[PDB]
Design a protein around this nucleic acid. Structure first.
Lengths: 18, 44, 487, 148, 175, 109
RNA sequence: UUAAUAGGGACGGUCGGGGGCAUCAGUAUUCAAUUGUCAGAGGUGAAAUUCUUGGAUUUAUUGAAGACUAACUACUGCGAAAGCAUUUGCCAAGGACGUUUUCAUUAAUCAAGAACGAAUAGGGAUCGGGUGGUGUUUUUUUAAUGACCCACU
């Protein structure tokens, strides 16, 4: 649970910015 | 007065200038299509 | 539009041509208003002048509610009194210009004047090819709604007192000079009083009429159509009112103590079809009660009885084409379906009533997620199902109607499409548990939906009512488009 | 209710407006809380124009220590705004036959609650009033769709 | 059928918590239903199917409105009688200044509650001023006089014309 | 089961008003008020005269055919005394004792 | 030569029934019209004044007007006071808090004169801000704003 999915969707936002 | 009907005329020309111009070019093209030639007129 | 200066009183479409157009606009350049104000100016463009003519023809009546006064030798003055005839009256020459026009030709001319005026008021789409480059009078089946083929074998003149139901004596030769003028006027009156508000407009056509004949003859001689008069047959062309055409009861005068004039014209006009009825509001009226048909409208029967009663016993009215177009409709397995009119949608209404009986029961069930919407998107809800909805006829593919189902906006919807559609599935399992729990008259099961590519987990809820109809339920959420555009 | 078309001791009627009791709006306004109201005017599918109302009251929670628990007056600028788009997405589609049917189980009030929860939750919220002003035309034929 | 309900502040809460039994005793004499909500802080009276005369629920409304503004209960139970008329006077919407509101409230009650009690002798009424309200029970013309004097006291009209005026009117009725 | 209307008692000061109307409300029936049946000008809102006028209104009600009714009580309100009169109870008591039917009444102050 | 718990200035998230301008909702009152209806209606301690069968009162409908934001509304918040409570938008402005930003005593108090106005140190509560959280909740939605509560200032 949470922390890992927040890391993955954190990487998804990393793809959202650039 | 003349200024009031002048404003009505300019406002109405503003209201119909679009289809007046495009429909006017349609008038030029269609009257270019349906025009009689003069040599047939002298012929009759 | 087939409009010309030719005599429309002979059963043609005309009376108003280019010459009457130029007299009309030339009269508009010398007034035209009610208080003799000028409608058109000499400094206008041809769109402004022509638009003023179409606006005058669309807005100002010259037949019933007014006429136009003008001077050929002084301002044009519109008068609000009509002579029950298309009236365009010169004072200098005392000539009514529109004498060649009939009443229906002027009402149809005003109708095309209003259609054309609305097309000139369109500022989005182009109507140039519509107004000036489209032929509507090439085919009457496109121009008109109905066309009745009327055969009239009238023979000679001395046969007319035996073949015409009316009397063509001296006075009809005085006012109505020919046979075809009193014929078109008479059939126009019988058909106009016969239908009334079931239609909107009508033209009567003498098919096969001629205006040319050689120098070796005195007049046009003919023998075709069973008579020696200048037509083959008579076509009845009809512009149909959609709101009042297929009603069961042709309305007549109200029944009172003393018989009025209109009740004598009514009962004289219908005879055995003239009757009395208490309406729904309790009014006792003279009327006519008819029967609808899925093969033909009532209008053919009214024109048939009116022309075979009041014009000629030898008339042969035929329109089998519209009978074919009604007959190629798939006749649904319903009681009195053959005696059901084409505009009736009562089976769709019964599916709507059974759907609302379903809607009240399902829409008030208790759930962990409250239903946002139960929205029908079926073809039978937009009345386009190719087969009309028959109870218990499940073999048709338009039987199960699709219904959109929406729950409350809640974060209980997962972030993966298979578990999302399986959550919709388990929600439909709770719906089926309540439905089979307490509404066992409604039958139900589950099916797959694989018409959407690569989403094999869509499960539709199929419900069969004791009214004999079936629905498939599908669920739409707000997480859907996020996952699809996400994908 | 609004009276439209009769047939011989058989008179249909149309919706005219939603009303609320006296006592309860005199009852629901408690001391030491925050009163929030809203309205908008909008055109529907057929061009019925209605001014809807919306009233909103704040609740207290479990284990609250203080006695008042008001809002912060910038939440209220947000919550009045948040409600406003929820009102417009509901309306202008599939009029009173479905719209009044949405009003009866107060699904829309729960939809308000589904969005308001991220700011400050609330209590009883109702719409409490609706009115009609701009019905276009009679339309007896579509009025007979509700009739059987 | 009919459901009348009102609220209460939380300092009255313990008192009504102690006497709600006698509330539903004087209330059960008239065959009415009632519930007490703690988390709302409300009292709700509702009619039963076994009621004799329904109109008393209006009185019951006033009665729980009497408990809405902290009226003592043996004084409050007079409203169920026939010859009783009551009045809650809301005095909030007159002055924006809280200072002048204290000036006119303290001016109304007078020093030591004398002048207020004077009204309770001049109108022969029970008057219990609760914050932004003024409680009045008793005769009907007495309620006309109390509402007249209070609604003239929230303005700049000095009440000595009312004490002296009803002082005249009491002695003229003696004669 | 019954025919229904609204009675709409307007209990004001110095007189109390009643007018039993139809369910639409625009059509009134048998209005006659309390001050009519007394000539003293002081007891126009008394409960004793309120019982007399409401008995007469209940008399003319069943004489037409109306058998059941609701009521909407109404004090003066607005900027006024906001409180129902004495005979507003006595109007409601006299018609209920007459034998009419009552259900779900409300306030329109 | 420092950068005062002297003063002043800058920025950030803000805060306010703070001001100026604009827009809008609500019912009430009065008046006019239409409908049902038809001898009384206002008023006082009663008297008296007032209205009325061209129908008074009331009912239901519509328009108009000016006025205001009823419960919540507090020993709360703002303004130097005079004063400031409908939605929404614009326009500057203000303080506090935060700050490892800037000048450097530029300061404090007051006749004359100006404008506006009739003319000692704890206890508890609460407002605004900030910070910490072996904290909760909204979270079957990945996250996360927000509220809540403990503690500090």
């Amino acid at each position: 649970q949470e922390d890992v999915q927040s890391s993955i969707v954190d990487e998804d936002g990393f793809t959202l910015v650039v | 007065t003349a200024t009031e009907s002048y404003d009505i005329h300019i406002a109405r020309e503003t209201a119909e200038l679009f289809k007046s111009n495009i429909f006017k070019l349609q008038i030029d093209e269609l009257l270019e299509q349906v025009k009689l030639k003069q040599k047939h007129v002298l012929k009759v | 539009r087939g409009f010309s200066s030719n005599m429309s009183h002979s059963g043609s479409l005309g009376g108003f041509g280019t010459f009457e157009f130029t007299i009309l606009m030339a009269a508009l350049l010398n007034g035209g208003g009610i208080n003799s104000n000028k409608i058109l100016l000499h400094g206008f463009s041809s769109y402004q002048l022509f638009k003023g003519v179409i606006k005058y023809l669309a807005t100002m009546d010259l037949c019933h509610d007014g006429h136009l006064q003008f001077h050929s030798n002084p301002a044009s003055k519109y008068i609000d009194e009509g002579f029950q005839t298309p009236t365009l009256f010169d004072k200098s020459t005392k000539v009514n210009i529109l004498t060649k026009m009939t009443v229906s030709s002027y009402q149809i001319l005003k109708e095309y004047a209003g259609e054309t005026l609305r097309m000139l008021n369109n500022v989005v789409q182009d109507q140039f090819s519509n107004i000036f480059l489209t032929n509507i009078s090439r085919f009457d089946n496109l121009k008109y709604d109905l066309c009745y083929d009327v055969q009239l074998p009238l023979g000679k003149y001395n046969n007319l007192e035996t073949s015409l139901a009316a009397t063509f004596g001296s006075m009809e030769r005085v006012k109505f000079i020919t046979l075809e003028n009193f014929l078109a006027h008479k059939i126009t009156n019988v058909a106009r009083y016969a239908l009334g508000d079931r239609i909107k407009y009508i033209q009567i056509e003498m098919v096969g009429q001629k205006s040319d004949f050689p120098i070796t003859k005195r007049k046009v001689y003919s023998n075709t159509g069973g008579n020696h008069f200048n037509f083959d047959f008579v076509r009845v062309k009809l512009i149909v009112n959609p709101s009042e055409c297929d009603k069961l009861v042709t309305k007549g005068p109200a029944h009172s103590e003393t018989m009025s004039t209109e009740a004598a014209v009514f009962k004289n006009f219908w005879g055995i079809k003239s009757s009395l009825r208490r309406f729904k509001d309790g009014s006792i009226t003279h009327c006519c009660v008819w029967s609808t048909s899925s093969s033909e409208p009532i209008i053919s029967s009214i024109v048939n009885f009116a022309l075979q009663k009041h014009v000629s016993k030898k008339a042969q009215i035929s329109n089998e084409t519209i009978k074919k177009f009604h007959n190629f409709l798939p006749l649904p397995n319903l009681p009195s379906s053959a005696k059901t009119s084409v505009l009736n949608l009562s089976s769709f209404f019964n599916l709507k009533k059974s759907f609302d009986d379903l809607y009240k029961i399902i829409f008030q069930m208790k759930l962990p997620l409250s239903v946002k919407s139960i929205l029908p998107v079926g073809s039978a809800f937009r009345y386009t199902s190719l087969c009309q909805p028959v109870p218990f006829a499940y073999s048709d593919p338009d039987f199960f109607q699709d219904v959109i189902l929406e729950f409350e906006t809640s974060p209980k919807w997962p972030d993966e499409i298979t578990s999302l559609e399986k959550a919709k599935t388990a929600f439909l399992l709770k719906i089926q548990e309540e439905l089979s729990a307490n509404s066992s008259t409604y039958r139900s099961f589950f099916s797959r939906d694989e018409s959407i590519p690569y989403n094999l987990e869509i499960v539709t809820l199929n419900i069969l009512t004791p009214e004999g109809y079936g629905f498939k339920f599908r669920v739409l959420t707000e997480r859907d488009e996020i996952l699809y555009l996400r994908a | 209710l609004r009276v439209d078309e009769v047939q011989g001791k058989n008179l249909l009627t149309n919706f005219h407006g939603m009303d609320f009791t006296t006592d309860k709006l005199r009852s629901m306004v408690r001391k030491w809380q925050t009163l929030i109201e809203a309205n908008v005017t909008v055109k529907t599918s057929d061009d019925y124009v209605l001014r809807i109302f919306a009233i909103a009251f704040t609740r207290k929670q479990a284990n609250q220590v203080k006695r008042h628990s008001y809002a912060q007056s910038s939440h209220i600028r947000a919550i009045r705004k948040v409600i406003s788009e929820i009102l417009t997405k509901e309306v202008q589609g599939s009029t009173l036959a479905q719209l009044t049917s949405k009003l009866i189980p107060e699904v829309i009030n729960k939809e308000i609650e589904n969005a308001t929860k991220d700011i400050f939750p609330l209590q009883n919220i109702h719409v409490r009033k609706v009115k009609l002003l701009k019905q276009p035309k009679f339309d007896v034929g579509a009025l007979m769709a509700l009739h059987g | 059928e009919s459901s009348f309900m009102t609220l209460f502040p939380k300092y009255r809460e313990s008192y009504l918590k102690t006497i709600w039994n006698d509330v539903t005793r004087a209330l059960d004499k008239h065959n009415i239903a009632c519930v007490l909500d703690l988390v709302e802080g409300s009292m709700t009276v509702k009619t039963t199917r076994k009621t004799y005369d329904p109109a008393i629920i209006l009185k019951a409304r006033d009665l729980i409105k009497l408990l809405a503004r902290s009226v003592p209960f043996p004084q409050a139970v007079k409203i169920l009688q026939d010859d009783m008329a009551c009045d809650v006077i809301k005095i909030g919407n007159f002055v924006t200044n809280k200072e002048r509101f204290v000036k006119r409230r303290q001016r109304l009650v007078g020093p030591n509650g004398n002048t207020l009690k004077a009204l309770e002798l001049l109108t022969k009424c029970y008057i219990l001023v609760q914050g932004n309200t003024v409680s009045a029970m008793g005769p009907f013309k007495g309620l006309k006089e109390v509402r007249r004097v209070v609604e003239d006291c929230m303005k700049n009209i000095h009440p000595i014309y009312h004490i002296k005026e009803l002082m005249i009117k009491r002695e003229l009725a003696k004669r | 089961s019954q025919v229904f209307g609204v009675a709409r008692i307007y209990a004001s000061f110095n007189d109390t008003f009643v007018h039993v109307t139809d369910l639409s409300g625009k059509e009134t029936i048998a209005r006659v008020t309390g001050g009519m049946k007394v000539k003293a000008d002081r007891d126009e809102s008394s409960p004793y005269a309120a019982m007399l006028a409401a008995q007469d209104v209940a008399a003319k009600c069943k004489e037409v055919g109306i058998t059941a009714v609701h009521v909407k009580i109404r004090a003066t309100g607005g900027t006024r005394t906001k409180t129902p009169g004495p005979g507003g109870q006595a109007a409601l008591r006299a018609l209920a004792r007459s034998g009419l039917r009552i259900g779900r009444i409300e306030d329109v102050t």
